[PDB]
Design a protein around this nucleic acid. Structure first.
Ligand SMILES: [Mg+2]
Ligand SMILES: [Mg+2]
Ligand SMILES: [Mg+2]
Ligand SMILES: [Mg+2]
Ligand SMILES: [Mg+2]
Ligand SMILES: [Mg+2]
Ligand SMILES: [Mg+2]
Ligand SMILES: [Mg+2]
Ligand SMILES: [Mg+2]
Ligand SMILES: [Mg+2]
Ligand SMILES: [Mg+2]
Ligand SMILES: [Mg+2]
Ligand SMILES: [Mg+2]
Ligand SMILES: [Mg+2]
Ligand SMILES: [Mg+2]
Ligand SMILES: [Mg+2]
Ligand SMILES: [Mg+2]
Ligand SMILES: [Mg+2]
Ligand SMILES: [Mg+2]
Ligand SMILES: [Mg+2]
Ligand SMILES: [Mg+2]
Ligand SMILES: [Mg+2]
Ligand SMILES: [Mg+2]
Ligand SMILES: [Mg+2]
Ligand SMILES: [Mg+2]
Lengths: 204, 52, 147, 211, 95
RNA sequence: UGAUGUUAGGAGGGCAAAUCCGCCGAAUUUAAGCAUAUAAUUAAGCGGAAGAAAAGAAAAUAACUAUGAUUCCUUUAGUAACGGCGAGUGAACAAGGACCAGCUCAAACGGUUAAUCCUUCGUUUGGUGCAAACCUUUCGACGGAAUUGUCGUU
RNA sequence: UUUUAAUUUAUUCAUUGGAAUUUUUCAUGUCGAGUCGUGUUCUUUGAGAUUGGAGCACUAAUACGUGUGAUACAUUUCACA
RNA sequence: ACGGACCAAGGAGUCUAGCAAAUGUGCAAGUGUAUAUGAUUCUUUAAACAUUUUAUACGCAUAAUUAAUG
């Protein structure tokens, strides 16, 4: 069908056409607010691969994130501790930039909604650009649909602050299995807790 | 301060438990021992004392 | 039981058995295995000689199920049979037993001891040693390899 | 340290008191568990609460001679008894979509287990007093007389258990059949001394076949 | 070690083909889409460079092409496959 | 296409934490000193849920005659490994049990006819209530969403 | 009072649409990209010419492909997914 | 040389893990019924009783030595 050709074209990104298009997109994304809504998905084929559906309760937003590392928070760059802990200027965060982009729109601006997924739409020396899918759990169009209404249960509130979206699965260590990820399930802290435990019989 | 992980119980060898039960039934069949535990059985006929 | 503890005997005495001049202070020589190689050296040397240093090759992911191998000597080989069944093989000279030690949990037959003279026997196993196999051949038997 | 003792080793250097667990209720819990799985039976109203599992060997040279229960029959074992995976689930029969059959012996063994199970159960019709034939390999329904006279017999729960080994550990032979000119140690050592080159020749055979 | 699928095992515990002796048991739409995408997209810059080096046509040129593809992509493997693909493309162009 | 609207209908905000999920992040102490190490992927700090939460239907083991989603108990084992190879640290596979369950989208296929969805206003049945109230149940109309892709098949 | 198991009756007629297996016929289609991976820097792990995560630069293949098989390479066989 | 004006009550070698020696007990080339399951166990009983209807769960012992193929 149609979507296959878009998928093959977007695989290049260094052809003349795709380079021109990406330059034009990335210029205009700079002038708009940090968090703004769009009316349609700008990559319909890539959005279908994730959970996006053309139904009344689905919306798209766009977010802009700043790149690089964050300096450690000590005043005047003075650490009071041992030389192993005196590092600053190359400390690196546990979370992705994609997860931070999802949380910029998910925490307060659209507390009405629930976060599903996001995808890359461009980048630059200063910023990275994404697009986030949100679903409304109070509209009856999604609430009557037997395929998509798992999202309207309260155990799925704020998936992007508990690590439950795809980008959260990536940095939690749950994208690999077996002998390379042996101590990560059901969570790192719970696996650690099970191994510290001392169990002790009554009669002994 | 007292703690709940004081070892409250013991585990006993199965063969010794069976030995003790057996040697305890045998002591039930000696007239002088039953008298020396405080039972008032002076008028009894036989100490094993089977009933229909 | 607190009833029989040694400390109850020293209840009226001043020092509780630890001495006037050298008291019972807390950690007067270090913590754990602290001072070895410096001031605990003699204890380490005369009770645990080969403690310091390393020797040999590394084995990075062992998997011990690959080399599990319990053994049995030829001493204990006729004792696996019951006495009554052990008895009739003595009188009759035309029949020999065939023994499968892998049904009993043994893997390799090993060759210490003495077999009865002129009393044949046939043995199945995964591994044999040279001496064991010779001793089985001497009394008129045969070794069979299985898997 | 000062005496002839073993060198100390204890792993008590963190805050170990926060997570200690004394087990006071290991028998209370088994009473509770027994009562729950007994309550299930009175709600199933005659049908058992167990499910049929296959017989498989254990994976290692340490255990390969003994067998145990697996988690479900393969597709090829089910078709040997004229069953479909979807239909079989509605009976207490399990399905494993990813086990294989590398030998004939396991195939026949599990086919026989399935046939023995399928031959010893009576079917109760969906709508009462309306008996019909089966579907997807399910036996046909039973009439009310057999259903009445089989509710008083004791169910056989022994069919669900794993097979018992009966291989003997000794036997008898005639002395005239003994082979004298055999050398086991020499064979065992010549076989090891020859493995590398046989592997090489097998790889050359594989290369030749691929073209 | 190795085993043979034919010729059943021998009941010995060691060696080649050992073990117990159980019985053993044994797109034109893609090219149409590729051609349309080739009309639309063209060639990536490093691909253009690789084509040039392949066109020069010596052994030093082939070695440099391999090194360049390896550097751009990583992985000797990936670079070798890329060199083969470009060689086929350039051969086809000359006909 | 964006702004605007005391337009009609709705959502978020705060409290509480023993058990749960994500981030941030020490030093006391031990090494008889001390800087790597240890304390600890811990305490304090900031966010988010439920009667449980998280995990979960193989880009998994093994090297055998082979097993077969996740979780937890017994063991593997203070073992393979890490370490001023010092003080110290330290998992995985097989084995025995508790329980036992499997599925959807995307991508293929359907154009003598988007089959799909939602709001508002109507009607048509039987049961339960003293009452309040509730359950079940087809059939319409006008308006809108949707071909920049809903629904059916597998 | 709550609910859940057996046991007790369904008779006659009337459509319309679904499904499993079997006999033969013709078709080998699809399979998630600034992702995977590599270099480099910092953390974390029992993980060792680097166990997982993260920042920056470079940037794939199309199932005969891709990934894993605990010591860094080149040319290959095999198994598993 | 330091503490002590007087009286009453309180007040300090204990608990858990892991190893060894000594001694008492049971069985003995074996020994210990783990987690579970069973029962005409169920105030006490959170105790006690049982073990899957030529019999391969696991620990320690029954064999040592070597970096190691063995
Ligand atoms: Mg500090
Ligand atoms: Mg940090
Ligand atoms: Mg004195
Ligand atoms: Mg004193
Ligand atoms: Mg507010
Ligand atoms: Mg809040
Ligand atoms: Mg110090
Ligand atoms: Mg000190
Ligand atoms: Mg100091
Ligand atoms: Mg805290
Ligand atoms: Mg809540
Ligand atoms: Mg959940
Ligand atoms: Mg989940
Ligand atoms: Mg375990
Ligand atoms: Mg390290
Ligand atoms: Mg640690
Ligand atoms: Mg298991
Ligand atoms: Mg589609
Ligand atoms: Mg795929
Ligand atoms: Mg660390
Ligand atoms: Mg492996
Ligand atoms: Mg003084
Ligand atoms: Mg004074
Ligand atoms: Mg003793
Ligand atoms: Mg041990």
């Amino acid at each position: 069908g149609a979507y296959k050709y878009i998928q093959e074209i977007w695989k290049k990104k260094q052809s003349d056409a795709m380079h021109f298009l990406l330059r034009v997109r990335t210029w205009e994304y700079r002038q708009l607010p940090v968090v703004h809504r769009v009316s349609k998905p700008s990559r319909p084929d890539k959005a279908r691969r994730l959970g996006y559906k053309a139904i009344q309760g689905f919306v798209i937003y766009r977010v802009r994130v700043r790149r690089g590392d964050r300096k450690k928070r000590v005043k005047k760059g003075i650490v009071h501790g041992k030389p192993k802990h005196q590092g600053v200027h190359k400390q690196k965060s546990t979370r992705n930039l994609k997860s931070v982009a999802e949380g910029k729109v998910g925490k307060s601006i659209c507390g009405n909604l629930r976060v599903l997924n996001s995808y890359w739409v461009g980048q630059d020396a200063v910023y990275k650009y994404y697009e986030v899918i949100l679903v409304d759990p109070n509209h009856n169009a999604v609430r009557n649909n037997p395929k998509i209404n798992w999202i309207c249960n309260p155990v799925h509130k704020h998936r992007e602050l508990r690590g439950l979206t795809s980008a959260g699965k990536k940095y939690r260590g749950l994208r690999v299995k077996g002998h390379l990820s042996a101590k990560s399930r059901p969570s790192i802290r719970a696996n650690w807790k099970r191994r510290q435990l001392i169990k002790l019989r009554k009669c002994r | 301060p007292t703690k709940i992980w004081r070892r409250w119980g013991r585990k006993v060898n199965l063969k010794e438990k069976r030995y003790a039960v057996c040697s305890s039934i045998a002591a039930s069949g000696v007239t002088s021992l039953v008298l020396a535990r405080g039972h008032r059985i002076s008028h009894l006929k036989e100490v094993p004392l089977v009933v229909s | 039981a607190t009833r029989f503890k040694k400390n109850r005997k020293k209840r009226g005495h001043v020092s509780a058995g630890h001495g006037r001049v050298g008291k019972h202070r807390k950690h007067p020589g270090g913590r754990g295995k602290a001072g070895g190689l410096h001031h605990m050296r003699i204890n380490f040397d005369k009770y645990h000689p080969g403690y310091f240093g390393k020797v040999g090759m590394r084995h990075l992911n062992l998997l011990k199920n690959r080399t599990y191998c319990p053994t049995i000597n030829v001493d204990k080989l006729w004792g696996l049979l019951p006495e009554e069944k052990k008895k009739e093989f003595s009188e009759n000279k035309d029949i020999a037993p065939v023994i499968d030690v892998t049904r009993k949990g043994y893997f390799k037959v090993l060759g210490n001891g003495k077999l009865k003279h002129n009393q044949p026997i046939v043995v199945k196993a995964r591994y044999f040693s040279s001496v064991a196999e010779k001793k089985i051949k001497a009394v008129g038997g045969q070794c069979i390899l299985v898997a | 340290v000062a005496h002839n003792n073993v060198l100390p080793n204890v792993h008590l250097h963190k805050w170990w008191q926060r997570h200690v667990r004394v087990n006071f209720s290991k028998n209370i819990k088994k009473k509770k568990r027994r009562l729950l799985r007994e309550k299930r039976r009175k709600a199933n109203g005659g049908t058992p609460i167990e499910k049929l599992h296959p017989i498989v060997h254990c994976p290692t040279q340490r255990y390969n001679f003994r067998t145990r229960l697996g988690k479900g029959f393969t597709f090829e074992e089910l078709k040997g008894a004229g069953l479909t995976p979807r239909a079989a689930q509605t009976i207490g029969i399990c399905y494993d979509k990813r086990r294989k059959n590398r030998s004939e012996e396991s195939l026949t063994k599990n086919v026989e287990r399935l046939l023995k199970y399928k031959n010893s159960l009576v079917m109760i019709p969906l709508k009462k007093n309306k008996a019909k034939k089966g579907i997807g390999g399910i036996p046909a329904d039973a009439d009310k007389n057999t259903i009445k006279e089989f509710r008083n017999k004791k169910p056989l729960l022994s069919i669900f258990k794993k097979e018992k080994n009966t291989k003997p550990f000794y036997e008898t032979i005639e002395v005239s059949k003994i082979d004298k000119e055999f050398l086991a140690y020499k064979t065992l050592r010549r076989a090891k001394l020859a493995e590398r080159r046989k592997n090489r020749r097998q790889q050359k055979k594989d290369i030749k076949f691929k073209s | 070690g190795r085993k043979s699928t034919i010729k059943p095992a021998t009941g010995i515990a060691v060696g080649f083909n050992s073990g117990h002796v159980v019985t053993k048991r044994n797109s034109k739409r893609k090219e149409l889409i590729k051609d349309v995408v080739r009309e639309i997209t063209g060639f990536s810059p490093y691909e253009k460079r690789i084509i040039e080096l392949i066109k020069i046509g010596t052994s030093a040129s082939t070695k440099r092409s391999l090194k360049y593809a390896k550097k751009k992509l990583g992985t000797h493997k990936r670079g070798k496959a890329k060199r083969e693909e470009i060689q086929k493309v350039v051969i086809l162009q000359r006909r």
